[PDB]
Amino acid sequence: SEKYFVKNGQPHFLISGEVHYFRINPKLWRNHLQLLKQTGADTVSTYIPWDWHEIEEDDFDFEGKTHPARNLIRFIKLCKEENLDLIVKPGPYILAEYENQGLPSWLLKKLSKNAFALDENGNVISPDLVSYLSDEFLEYTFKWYDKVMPIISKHQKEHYGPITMMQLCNEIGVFQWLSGKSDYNPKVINLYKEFIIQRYKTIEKLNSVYSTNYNSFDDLKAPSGKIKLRSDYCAYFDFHLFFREYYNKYISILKNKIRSFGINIKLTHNIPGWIYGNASELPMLISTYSEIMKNHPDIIFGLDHIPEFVSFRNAHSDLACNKILEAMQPEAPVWAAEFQAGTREHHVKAYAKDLETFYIASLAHGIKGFNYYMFSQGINPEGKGFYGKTFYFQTALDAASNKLALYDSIKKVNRFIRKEQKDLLRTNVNSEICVGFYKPYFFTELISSQLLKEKKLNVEELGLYIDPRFLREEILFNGLLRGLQTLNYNYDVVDLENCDLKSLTAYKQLWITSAEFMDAETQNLLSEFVLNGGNLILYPAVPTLDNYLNRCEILKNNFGIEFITKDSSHKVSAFGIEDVFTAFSKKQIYNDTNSKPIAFTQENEICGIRKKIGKGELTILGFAFGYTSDEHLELIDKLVKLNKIKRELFVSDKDIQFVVRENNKSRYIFFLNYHNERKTFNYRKSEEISIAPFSYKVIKENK
Amino acid sequence: SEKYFVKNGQPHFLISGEVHYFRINPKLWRNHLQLLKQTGADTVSTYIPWDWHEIEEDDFDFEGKTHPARNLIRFIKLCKEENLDLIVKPGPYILAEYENQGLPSWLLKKLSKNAFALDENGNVISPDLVSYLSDEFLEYTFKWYDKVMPIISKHQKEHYGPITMMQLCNEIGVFQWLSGKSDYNPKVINLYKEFIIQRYKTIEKLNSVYSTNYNSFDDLKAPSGKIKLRSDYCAYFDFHLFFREYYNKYISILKNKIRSFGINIKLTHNIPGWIYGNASELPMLISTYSEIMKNHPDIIFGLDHIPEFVSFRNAHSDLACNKILEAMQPEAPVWAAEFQAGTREHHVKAYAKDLETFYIASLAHGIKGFNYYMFSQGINPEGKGFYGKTFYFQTALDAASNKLALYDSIKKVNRFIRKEQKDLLRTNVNSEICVGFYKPYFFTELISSQLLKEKKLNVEELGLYIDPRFLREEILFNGLLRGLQTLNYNYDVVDLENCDLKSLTAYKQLWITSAEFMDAETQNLLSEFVLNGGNLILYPAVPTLDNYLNRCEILKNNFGIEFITKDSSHKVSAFGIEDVFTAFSKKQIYNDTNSKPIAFTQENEICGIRKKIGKGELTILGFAFGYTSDEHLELIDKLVKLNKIKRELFVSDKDIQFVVRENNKSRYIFFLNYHNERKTFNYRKSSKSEEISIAPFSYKVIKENK
Ligand SMILES: O=c1ccc2cc(O[C@@H]3O[C@H](CO)[C@@H](O)[C@H](O)[C@H]3O)c(O)cc2o1
């Protein structure tokens, strides 16, 4: 049942370290590789920067003719001699704080205007930022591929070489995220128009969905500025769909070109989204790759985990991210393409004793492999660094291969992992709770994000009150998922799109965090789930609209629900818990015919009910709670206990986190202390131990 | 010349703990007070909530007639019996996670729409957010003061009662700030128009400053919407000046009212600004009090410190904030009206081991008194909790008066303070560095802040490139102040407004973080400073405009500087440090006339120079750096060393922070480890070496008898 990497026909925990040959004294390349191998790592990972090797137009140095650190061939030879497998990342974009994000200076200098990403007035957004589908950009990308891909093809694992995986480009769409700006290049806007025509077929069909009054597709303009009308929301929704298709077209073009060289190894891509040590935005970035993950089951996405510290402030971020990637990519191991080792930023400290705890927590939270980023510090060669001379700090090795404090922490965790990987990789948690991932609530990188300065989405202007980013960040990510983890209840996440009914029926509860809109397909799925015997928990809204904010009340009518939306005090009572703080004045007040009232406003109006529908059970709460009080944990606990779900252990200290992982034969109990307190506690199944601050203990049980 | 509190003509460390009588079983009041007293605390602090005591309109209970916990009189009497002095805070706002932020439900239901803070469209910003100078709001506030102020007056120290201090309202402007919108109530609009007419006298004079073409004052309205023209910036600048007069008017009205009851005790106010465990916007909020602090020498402002954790991530916020309070309030002790104890929110943990280090760090960083907030947990009665039933967590005492882990940390810190206060309160750090606090860079709460919904200020639209909020957050607060503290260089902060030349001349260096604009008075002061023998470090810009973005080239002309603004790579070299990352493409390029060039762009153009001018020294850097790379610390270290400024100690681990405080008798060495690493290091005075082991997120204090 578990997905994991394999080596010598056994489960293999992928332990990779990032070592940028182009940023390291070549005399010390062998020393870095030997010190990496000596931690128990099996793989090394690096960019092959286009700028670094195509030194002028059609002048390629991969052999150190012009600088010894351009000798990629020798670095590959060294990986073979030191028995490390190799992950290569030739771009064209590599980011990695490399000048021009890895694109050559000579290329950016001579590309025409129409090869760049353009704002809505036709201005170049950034002198570094090309349009992914520019004919000029792809012509030169292909000329770089023509030189680097034969080297990669020769050394690929399919030819018994060291190269086991290759990453295509780097964090596709990351520049649209960080800026909030879409590419309005006329070639992108022409592709958008093809996508719309393809989708709706006739202007009359589009007009009926958008409530527009176009006489033809020729009157359709790309959306821009703030959303004022429901028709602007609709246009922006399809603009988000279009960019997911667009990224799939871009990665497909790169993939087909790579395959043309007989490169048959595993291809990868990498998911950004951590900011200031939390990852509540990362599911939005995952959502931008929905079409890639649909269309390319041979491309493994990995996570970019950047926790910065390890505490209760961010304990829930890595688990939520791991569970969501598993939802969206169930057929591949969950792995970290970039797994924090040291720090990108000198002033943002990464302590060995914090990261060691993060690495063990990552095992507890289901990670199957990772690439320490950065294992080795780098020195930017002559003016190639976008920032200072130094690339990363507090790594395992400095740029001169001096061992730093993190080295011994990585050796200790790698030793544990190698000892256990055969059993540990084959263990799972027993989840009786399933949490729905409704991808359309996440499709907002152009209109509403933590990085977007000025919000283009203001739902009040559309006659709505539940903002999908507030819901997915505060009610879902920082609320339910944080609460379940804190309470030590296992959950799984499931992608609701084209979702198997049979795959929901394993779980004793399905939790849906719902806004006022939800497509017919998901409303029908949830209707069938309950009617066939499923237990659904749904809040803060029974949806009444589809993704285009057109009437859709399938779930409401199937469940015999009637409500009025009414203003009350933020505080409600729910299952006899008084003073539950809720996010909104506006609540759904339910007709209680054939229902049990279980929640009440300050004026005693019914804002939550339970009822039987066919063979199943429904719990609807017409109010939004996250986790910002002890009453919120008490409510999540009451709701889980409605279907008699139990924790795997009794632990005497409720602030100790545990994860029980098992298979037929083996059990691992991971105890995690996310607090600045020495804790002493005991445990028993549904026995006394001391854990230092910000630390861990792993217990093995034979079954 | 330290500022500290005095009791019986002796130095006295103010130690208060916050104990909310209205959230504690009255049968347990005495036990809370005794346990606070047993920590060596001398004072207890509480709100008196309007909503709690005016139970219906004109129905008052301070005696526990309708609920035992309304017996304010008994609580006051117990404070006296248990030998604690008492800070009272009767509002009208208390915030304090109390329903409607302390305002009665019956009041907010009764008030007409014009009692409320209104947005640009005339809509109510929040149903518990009043407009401060609303006629209706102040009428009911006065009727609340009519009943609570005679009790406070009767129980003052001078009448042998326990009351020594009273807070006026609570964090003026904090609710407006968190709302993300400013108040456009018609009272604000009308008071603004009067302010503009008083300021400019004629529409011609206003048109000449703004470059507008108004026919009369009747054509001008309070500015709304984004700044697109320099005239819109001018309008908003006067709107910011107006709001400082407005907050002074509010607190003057409360103060004059309080004084009419024969209340002669010390009045206080409390400074907000911490959010998510840093305080980079606190200087903006304290800036909104500029007119209060000039007009009321008898109101002492204290800080509300909420660090939430204690690490290098937020190490610099408390020192910066303490230094900025001292700059604005130089004649009163630096103290914390609210000093974090436990956590206001269950999901944001407050660890005893963190807060104990915060308490010692605060002493290192010159705090002279504090009120542990919250010393005692509360339970909200009768649904009064804004966010839940429980008020605070991981406090010194739970609501029942059981000791929690933090109790022992507070007893340890208090014991050290009581043993040492007579010397400690009289100690100084030796600061050879002065950093200028230019208040108008902070006057952006209407147009640019971390909390404001709308970005109204885009300097590029104005032909500018140095955003004042970017400068003051990243180049000053998180940049220079963070770097000096990390490098263990003592600094003082000095308010440049009406600044005495003589108060700047004691320092070896004066550091000015400058935008492209600065008023004539400040340009002149910095000119005179250097000409008379001061050493000035100025970056990232020689200013050329005044506060209204009109021509002012006084400092440029007085220092004999010629420059062109030119685009280049973000990276410069400075004093032989290569690949120093700077915030802007645009840099000031200086010619080398009568100067030593000491920084260069990627094209080897001069973007930094040093020169002698009259008796003084000038170092200008035409580029912006904060602290986002090792090169920045190297650069700050080099600039400090230009005047042979030395650290107090040689310490073997550069990541150990230290503060040496001394007087004639006594030296205290504070070591602070803001890192998750057990550190073993040696040290020595810059005039054999001592070895120290320090736990993660921990401290040592050495005392020496001189
Ligand atoms: O609707 C409201 C009104 C007031 C209000 C005050 C609150 O507290 C303030 O929070 C600031 C930010 O962290 C601090 O700078 C300040 O010192 C605190 O007094 C709060 O948490 C929530 C609130 O919600």
Ligand SMILES: [Ca+2]
């Ligand atoms: Ca019904």
